[PDB]
Amino acid sequence: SRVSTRSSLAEDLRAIGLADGDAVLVHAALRKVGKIVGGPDDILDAMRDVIGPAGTVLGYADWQLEDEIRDDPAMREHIPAFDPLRSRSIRDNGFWPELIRTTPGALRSASPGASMAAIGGEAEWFTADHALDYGYGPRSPLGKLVEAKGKVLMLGAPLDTMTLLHHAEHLADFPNKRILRYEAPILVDGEKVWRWFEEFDTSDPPDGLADDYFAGIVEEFLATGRGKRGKIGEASSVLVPADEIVAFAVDWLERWGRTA
Amino acid sequence: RVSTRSSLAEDLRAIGLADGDAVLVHAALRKVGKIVGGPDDILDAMRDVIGPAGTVLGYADWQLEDEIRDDPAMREHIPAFDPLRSRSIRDNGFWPELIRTTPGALRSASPGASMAAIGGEAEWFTADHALDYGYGPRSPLGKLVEAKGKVLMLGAPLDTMTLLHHAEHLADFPNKRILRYEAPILVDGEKVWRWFEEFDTSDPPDGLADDYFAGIVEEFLATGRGKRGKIGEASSVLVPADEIVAFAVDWLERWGRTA
Ligand SMILES: CC(C)(COP(=O)(O)OP(=O)(O)OC[C@H]1O[C@@H](n2cnc3c(N)ncnc32)[C@H](O)[C@@H]1OP(=O)(O)O)[C@@H](O)C(=O)NCCC(=O)NCCS
Ligand SMILES: CC(C)(COP(=O)(O)OP(=O)(O)OC[C@H]1O[C@@H](n2cnc3c(N)ncnc32)[C@H](O)[C@@H]1OP(=O)(O)O)[C@@H](O)C(=O)NCCC(=O)NCCS
Incomplete structure (x- = not known):
């Protein structure tokens, strides 16, 4: 029954480990934050204060x-x-990705189902050259988040919503990866065209793993003591190094497949 | 039954939108029912019908x-x-956010009377919106009348016709409740608190119920200068802005003369 401010939220974000200049992919259940004086926009503005205009x-x-x-x-x-x-x-x-996407200055990636909204100093870089096929691989904001040693913040959201781990699925060497094929309308030379897409399936868990298996992995990774937990507003949160959990999740998957 | 950009267009043409129209829309998007490309299809269908100049x-x-x-x-x-x-x-x-967050859309300055607009004259409608008395003649509502625009209640309840607050402003009757409040706006690109004054739009004139707007609109429809019809699955009405205000002003002024 405490209220959060743009100012209060910046302190939580600094405590959780967010700092100057870095890139953070955010997943959120905004109701968990509880009351905010200026609504959820106070969160985005708190963040941008903490990371600065280059983050x-x-x-x-x-x-x-x-x-x-x-x-x-x-x-x-x-x-x-x-x-x-x-x-x-x-x-x-x-509401969170729409919050960002509609904030002035924001940009949005090209690959439709895997599309990311970004805002800040490197927003251009992250949304540029998002591959249409296998848009969860190396040529995507996710693959770029790893290269820039960015961060993922679970802002109250359920832990099996960490999209970054789909990048790990793409990278990991395990047997019988399901392939998704579908056709969707996009724009070619200013006009509407239907196009066939190809990617690993991210909508379903592979080989009988539970639908929430992403959650156990984040949980396990946090036990190693290289993530960090904290409350942002009233919401229990998780901040995690992007490249360290991808590499971690690739080994989890690579072993599980062998182990079978 | 599903609606489309094409389908919604013909319903919007059936109710009475045409090339060049200005239209203030109030909406209950949920009762339009299922739309293929989302509610953005409504805005896209509207613009097709009224054109880039509407x-x-x-x-x-x-x-x-x-x-x-x-x-x-x-x-x-x-x-x-x-x-x-x-x-x-x-x-x-969602409807006003829908418009506001559409690229090319614009918004005016008077915070509580703030209007979102999109299209050929969106610059004109949003410009020079008076801070004090933002429902008077130097507001988008006042310009709607000057432009002989329209109001479409898209499934919305009828007492939400904000255009009639403009009539409250214009209409001469006794003891209008004046409202003073303080609010943070941008001066010099900097936050500055400021004292406003409007006629009250949050409560009716002492007398009428909070939903009396609904009575007036229904009586204007009885005259036969409105038009009723279905947009998607939503019961809708479309009225001329100039005529509904004129109507409402007289209704208001007549009631005050019962002194
Ligand atoms: C499903 C999920 C989104 C549910 O979220 P939620 O907690 O219900 O809340 P949301 O994030 O949608 O946000 C709701 C709050 O947004 C705020 N909000 C929404 N629109 C707003 C607006 N236009 N203006 C101001 N505030 C607004 C309100 O506080 C709203 O609460 P209300 O419903 O009481 O008004 C959450 O459980 C979740 O799964 N989050 C992660 C999802 C994700 O990132 N998935 C990635 C792929 S798996
Ligand atoms: C209050 C009121 C809006 C509630 O009606 P509603 O039926 O909930 O309509 P909304 O406009 O909120 O739209 C709801 C529909 O949003 C669509 N919608 C909302 N956001 C969307 C989005 N981002 N993307 C796609 N669809 C979205 C869905 O159909 C949604 O409902 P769902 O929860 O079933 O998905 C309505 O009764 C009303 O009075 N409207 C007029 C308000 C007005 O103009 N007031 C003037 C001043 S008094």
Whole structure:
């Protein structure tokens, strides 16, 4: 029953381990933060204060389509193509990625289901050259987050929502990786075109692992004492080094596959 | 039954939008039912019908809650109203945010009377919005009448026709409740608290119920100069701005003469 301020939130974020200049991909359950004087926008502004204008805040936008094509052909000519400036974020990811995407100055990646919204000094870099096929691999904001030794913050969100770990699935050498194939409308030369996509499946867990297996891995990684826990506002949170948990999750997966 | 950009276009043409129209829209998006490309299809269908020269509006207002007055000793943690950054009030539903967050959209200065606009004259409608008395003649509402614009209640309840607050402003009747409040805005790009004054829009004139706007709109429809119809699955009405205000002003002025 405490209220948070732009000012109060900056202190929590510094305590959790966020500092000057780094890139943080944020997953959030905003109601967990409790009351905020200026709403959730106070959070983004708190963050940007802490990391400074060279830091970058990321969100997982995804897109809103709903497999409508598969749900209904002959609904095909009525589906607006994916437009990184105009396609609104998937609602399942909560308000946060839409908060960012609609904040002035923000930018948004090209690969439609894997699309990220970013804001700050390197927003351009992170949203540039997002590959259309295998958009969870090396040529994506996720792969870039690893190269820049960025961070992931679970802002009250459930721990099996850490999208970064899909990058690990892509990288890890294990047997029988499911492949997803689907066709979706996008823009080519200013016009709407339908295009066939190819990627590892991220919508389903592989080989009988539970749907929430991402959570156990984050949990395990935190036990090693190289993550950090803390409260932001009223929300229990987790801040984690991007490159250290990817490499960690790749070994978890690589062993599980062998072990079978 | 599903709606599309094409489908919504024909419903919008059926109700009476045309090339060049200005339209202030109030909406209850949920009863439009299922739309293929989301509610953005409504805005996209509207713009098709009215064209690049037509303009669509939404009532943005802002998220303050008298927090200022809810608890000073938070006074200072209250960000100023920024027409480019302040989200619209959630009581007005998604529609105004939808417009506001569409690229090319614009917003005016008067925080509580703040309007979102998009299209050919969006610059004109949002410009020079008076801080004091933001529902008078130098507001987007006043310009709507000057432009012979329209109001579309998209499934919305009828007493949410903000345009009629403009009539309250214009109409001469006794004992209008004047309202004074203090609010943080940007002066010189810096937060500065400022005392406002408006006629009250939060409570009716002493007398009428809080929803009397609904009575008036229904009586204007009885005259036969409105038009009723279905946009998607939402029961809707479309009225001329100029005519509804004129109507409402007389209704108001007549009632005050019962002195
Ligand atoms: C599903 C999930 C999003 C649920 O979130 P939630 O806690 O219900 O809340 P949300 O983040 O959607 O945000 C809700 C709060 O946003 C705030 N909010 C929403 N819109 C707002 C607005 N326009 N203006 C101001 N505040 C707003 C409100 O406080 C809202 O609460 P309310 O519903 O009481 O108003 C959360 O459980 C979760 O899974 N988060 C992580 C999801 C994710 O990142 N997924 C990645 C892929 S798996
Ligand atoms: C209050 C009021 C808005 C509630 O109506 P509502 O049916 O909840 O309508 P909303 O406009 O909030 O839209 C809800 C629909 O949003 C769509 N929506 C909201 N955000 C969306 C988004 N980001 N992307 C896609 N769809 C979204 C969904 O259909 C959503 O409902 P869901 O929860 O079923 O998904 C309505 O009764 C009303 O009075 N509207 C007029 C308000 C007004 O103009 N007031 C003027 C001043 S008095």
